[PDB]
Design a protein around this ligand. Structure first.
Ligand code: HEM
Ligand code: HEM
Lengths: 145, 145
């Protein structure tokens, strides 16, 4: 149930999500690229999925990777904005899952994003409290896969 | 060239885009669905493209349509935010284009979106000048199709 998953987004969790996003979402180009490069560095087994992006080791200088990273940050923007209404959050999460599902991506695959998110957050001085909050959001996407 | 197209986005055009977006982009759910509904109302032949969404006449009540409409607005948000750096605008546009090219959406068909945009702008008191500004942004995407 994706609804039961969304219900775990309590007042405090939502507050921490916003407070952290106020900072990481301000530099979508930079932090988006950071998230992606960290993903490829900690989980080399995932690179195969982004073959179209060329050499992802170039990072910021890779136009395709940059385009992807910025856009990815807008999916996160989308979720944060829907936190006030669980009904809308679920429909966007599910809309979002469709493309990943067709790519044969599984829930176990998505769980690998918690590491990168946690590391980026820490580089911006956001501790475990925030990493946990973001894991709850990711869990919502997982329940939809 | 997508770059050449981006040149049409002069200072005055960019200003008209931001100003109007501050309004239409502030109610993504409501304005997103209005855009889609208008498209289906004026271009019935496009309904077949969205079979996944189901019965699109259900409007706001169609969760699938709502999720898509809200997400559609974040792509536009992405474009607006990259206006001052064509290098970034270009890579997000090309990235965005990928999925629409696979669906066989031609440049001419993409242009069918100028009608809905013009009408939603009008409904919020933004005239011809703003519509023409938005048609230029659309032209940038058409340059990638
Ligand atoms: C919070 C986690 C994630 C977010 C917010 C996210 C976001 C996005 C967005 C917005 C797109 C572009 C639209 C689309 O085609 O769907 C996308 C594309 C893609 N995603 Fe994800 N994604 C996430 C996790 C993953 C994971 C875990 C994988 C891999 C196992 C994955 C694989 C892909 C691939 C291969 C593409 C297409 C890349 C391209 O060809 O340009 N995503 N993702
Ligand atoms: C300003 C114009 C448009 C924008 C910004 C836009 C935006 C989007 C976005 C963001 C998605 C979902 C995310 C993704 O695919 O990665 C999407 C999906 C799609 N778009 Fe567009 N689009 C536009 C015009 C059109 C037009 C003119 C057509 C065809 C008449 C079209 C056909 C589709 C189709 C078939 C899908 C898949 C829908 C689904 O099954 O969920 N789009 N579009």
């Amino acid at each position: 149930s994706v609804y039961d998953a969304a219900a775990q987004l309590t007042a405090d969790v939502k507050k921490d999500l916003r407070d952290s996003w106020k900072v990481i979402g301000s530099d979508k180009k930079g932090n988006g690229v950071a998230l992606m490069t960290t993903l490829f560095a900690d989980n080399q087994e995932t690179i195969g999925y982004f073959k179209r992006l060329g050499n992802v080791s170039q990072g910021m200088a890779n136009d395709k990777l940059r385009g992807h990273s910025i856009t990815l940050m807008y999916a996160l923007q989308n979720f944060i904005d829907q936190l006030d209404n669980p009904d809308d959050l679920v429909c966007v999460v599910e809309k979002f899952a469709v493309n990943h599902i067709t790519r044969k991506i599984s829930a176990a695959e998505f769980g690998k994003f918690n590491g990168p998110i946690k590391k980026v957050l820490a580089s911006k001085n956001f501790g475990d409290k925030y990493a946990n909050a973001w894991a709850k959001l990711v869990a919502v996407v997982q329940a939809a896969l």
